[PDB]
Design a protein around this ligand. Structure first.
Ligand SMILES: O=C(O)Cn1c2ccccc2c(=O)c2ccccc21
Ligand SMILES: O=C(O)Cn1c2ccccc2c(=O)c2ccccc21
Lengths: 187, 183
């Protein structure tokens, strides 16, 4: 009775997070010496994954919020493990503004399986309603969170940021949500 | 409706890897032919082969899996910046396949990564499943993928080699496929 969301969560963990998280702190260490310690404390150490529950496709990190500003690429990560033979990965550091002030800095990215989930909704043969897509998106999140909890070392370096985007609201600030999560990790 | 983990995996493996690696594929081959005397001269040598062992096994590392199958060199590195992925480099490996202790052919060879996720999913205590359930999914993953690539002829860049263990050699199994595709 396992469904599409379940396979997406597992695959993303085994297929991406597994490869990306263990080298994370070292990658950050190098960055801080290199960049005068932007990635200052907890809340800067984690890899933040954006998961918009959206009727539509989310905006690029470059455009989505003026208060979200690309600062620097993290050092590259080299992968020669398992199925993956000599693959190079990268992560971006963003400055987060609040009230026109630098309010946070962190490593931020969308969850790639969104693209896929999306494509599966559009496909004519087995396409499923926006309601059905969201159903699957919600579950993928729960399932992925449930995975991460089991594995604390992977879990330490990683946070899921899932939020509803109002299609029709005057204001949603991605920056505020991120700050909200970064600060919420008081502990 | 009736969708399950295999479908999910198929689309992800296409949208997440195949879609990124297939389009640049032919340009990559040309440089290599230029790099090493037109080694991948024909069809069957110009396509990407995704190794899919139905018996999960290991699945044994290609460098170690068979003597007749041996690593020759990398295809030229592929750079990706499209979609949600940015600033990534992808690597593919060329293996010459010995026959009678002699090279019958050469090609680009790799195992299907979703196999690892399928195996991992089985081990989880909650909702974890038998090999038989795992087997059905690995299969369902094949057919599901299969349908998708047909829908994109844009296909002739890659094929699947799926095989169970002797009820046997990989080299002879790969060769069967590379030999079969006459046109
Ligand atoms: O993000 C990746 O590194 C590769 N990758 C995935 C890996 C696992 C599970 C799903 C996906 C996925 O849907 C996906 C979609 C678009 C691009 C890359 C993707
Ligand atoms: O093959 C990849 O590039 C990444 N990748 C995937 C991409 C898409 C869909 C599934 C998987 C997957 O299960 C997987 C499993 C282990 C390692 C990498 C993996």
């Amino acid at each position: 009775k396992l469904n599409v969301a379940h396979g997406l969560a597992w695959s993303y963990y085994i297929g991406y997070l597994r490869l990306i998280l263990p080298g994370l702190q070292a990658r950050i260490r190098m960055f801080n010496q290199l960049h005068n310690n932007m990635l200052s404390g907890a809340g800067s150490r984690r890899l933040y994954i954006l998961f918009p529950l959206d009727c539509g496709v989310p905006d690029n990190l470059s455009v989505v919020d003026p208060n979200i500003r690309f600062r620097d690429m993290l050092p590259q990560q080299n992968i020669d493990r398992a199925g993956i033979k000599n693959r190079v990965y990268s992560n971006s550091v963003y400055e987060i503004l609040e009230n026109g002030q630098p309010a946070g800095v962190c490593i931020l990215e969308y969850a790639t399986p969104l693209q896929t989930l999306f494509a599966m909704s559009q496909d004519a043969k087995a396409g499923f309603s926006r309601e059905d897509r969201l159903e699957q998106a919600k579950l993928f999140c729960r399932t992925l969170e449930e995975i991460l909890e089991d594995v604390p070392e992977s879990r330490n370096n990683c946070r899921l940021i899932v939020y509803q985007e109002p299609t029709d609201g005057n204001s949603f600030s991605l920056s505020q949500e991120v700050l909200r999560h970064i600060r919420q990790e008081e502990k």
